[PDB]
Design an enzyme around this catalytic site. Structure first.
Site, PDB file in Angstrom:
ATOM      1  N   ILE A  71      -6.695   3.128  -0.876  1.00 44.47           N
ATOM      2  CA  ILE A  71      -6.095   2.801  -2.006  1.00 44.47           C
ATOM      3  C   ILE A  71      -5.433   4.173  -2.808  1.00 44.47           C
ATOM      4  CG2 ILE A  71      -5.486   1.213  -4.041  1.00 44.47           C
ATOM      5  CD1 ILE A  71      -6.519  -0.072  -1.405  1.00 44.47           C
ATOM      6  N   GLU A 160     -12.993  -2.247   1.871  1.00 42.36           N
ATOM      7  CA  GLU A 160     -13.831  -2.228   2.589  1.00 42.36           C
ATOM      8  C   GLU A 160     -14.676  -3.509   3.520  1.00 42.36           C
ATOM      9  OE1 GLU A 160     -16.565  -0.081   2.884  1.00 42.36           O
ATOM     10  OE2 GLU A 160     -15.719   1.025   0.443  1.00 42.36           O
ATOM     11  N   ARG A 163     -12.995  -2.651   7.340  1.00 38.59           N
ATOM     12  CA  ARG A 163     -14.351  -2.126   7.588  1.00 38.59           C
ATOM     13  C   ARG A 163     -15.567  -2.514   8.096  1.00 38.59           C
ATOM     14  NH1 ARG A 163     -13.744   2.581   3.293  1.00 38.59           N
ATOM     15  NH2 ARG A 163     -12.422   3.078   2.605  1.00 38.59           N
TER      16      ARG A 163
END
Ligand SMILES: *[C@@H]1O[C@H](CO)[C@@H](O[C@@H]2O[C@H](CO)[C@@H](O[C@@H]3O[C@H](CO)[C@@H](O)[C@H](O)[C@@H]3O[C@@H]3OC[C@@H](O)[C@H](O)[C@H]3O)[C@H](O)[C@H]2NC(C)=O)[C@H](O)[C@H]1NC(C)=O
Length: 246
Positions: A71, A160, A163
């Site tokens: 970010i 996340e 990911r």
């Protein structure tokens, strides 16, 4: 760009947005079927713009670095806020340019500093779609310590999530109720770099890792990944950080 609205955002819609996010991050190579992220990209092309809308329609535009899905900053109203760091500072040169004012948050974009600033470890912060809706709202009206916390939530429910397939599920379950992240969830976030490097070093060592990565599984206790056959590799980690950025 990829967009998402929390207004009537059941586990499915979210799942779809996370898929879009993943498909937005370009790659050329694949290490064991897992997309290997590019080592660099220059100019505006290095940034992905997410348009998150809250239950009430209020929005913010977050900038992401497509080589590591970090970010960089966001745009609320006519203001842009960037983390206090080089890459973010570089990012500002390309994103949120018609923003009236640019503000630099007094902190860096890594987990540790964000926790110090907000005053609470990720373990004590309930994440989920409702909290994401809160976070989008908290970011609309500036407050550095309120933002440090809203950013810990925003990062975990998008970055996340994309990911690790596992973390995308943790959020879909908390789609109508928040709850602190599972220890399994934290260990994963703390391993993206380690796993990525090892999965890459395995290519040329018979899918074997030069060194093991310990986790928690979710059952609640120590785990050790020794090769690319493991569940984490075969069915969890969805994006690999190019070893070059290490
Ligand atoms: C490659 O990765 C795999 C995992 O992805 C590992 O290989 C083998 O994994 C088991 C997992 O438990 C290791 O643990 C013990 O293995 C011996 C021999 O197989 C068993 O007799 C032990 O009980 C124990 O594993 C059993 O597995 C069944 C389950 O009920 C329990 O886990 C347990 O009963 C193995 O030692 C390991 N193989 C070797 C040769 O060490 C490993 O991380 C890695 N190894 C290789 C060669 O690629």
């Amino acid at each position: 760009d990829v967009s998402f609205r929390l207004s009537g955002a059941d586990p499915r819609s979210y799942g779809m947005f996370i898929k879009d996010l993943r498909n937005a991050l370009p790659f050329r190579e694949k290490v064991y079927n897992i997309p290997l992220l590019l080592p660099s990209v220059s100019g505006a092309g290095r940034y992905l713009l997410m348009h998150l809308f809250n239950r009430d329609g209020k929005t913010i535009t977050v900038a992401v670095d497509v080589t590591n899905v970090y970010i960089m900053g966001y745009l609320a109203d006519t203001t842009s806020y960037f983390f206090n760091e080089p890459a973010a500072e570089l990012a500002s040169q390309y994103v949120f340019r018609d923003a009236r004012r640019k503000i630099t948050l007094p902190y860096s974009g890594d987990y540790e500093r964000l926790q110090i600033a907000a005053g609470k470890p990720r373990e004590k912060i309930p994440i989920g779609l409702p909290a994401l809706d809160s976070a989008i709202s908290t970011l609309l009206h500036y407050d550095s310590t309120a933002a440090a916390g809203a950013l810990l939530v925003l990062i975990q429910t998008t970055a996340e999530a994309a990911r690790f397939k596992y973390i995308e599920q943790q959020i879909q379950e908390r789609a109508y109720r928040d709850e602190v992240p599972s220890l399994a969830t934290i260990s994963l976030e703390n391993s993206w770099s380690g796993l990525s490097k090892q999965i890459q070093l395995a290519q040329g060592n018979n899918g074997i890792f030069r060194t093991p990565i310990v986790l928690v599984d979710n059952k609640g206790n120590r785990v050790q990944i020794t090769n690319v056959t493991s569940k984490v590799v075969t069915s969890n980690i969805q994006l690999l950080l190019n070893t070059r950025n290490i």
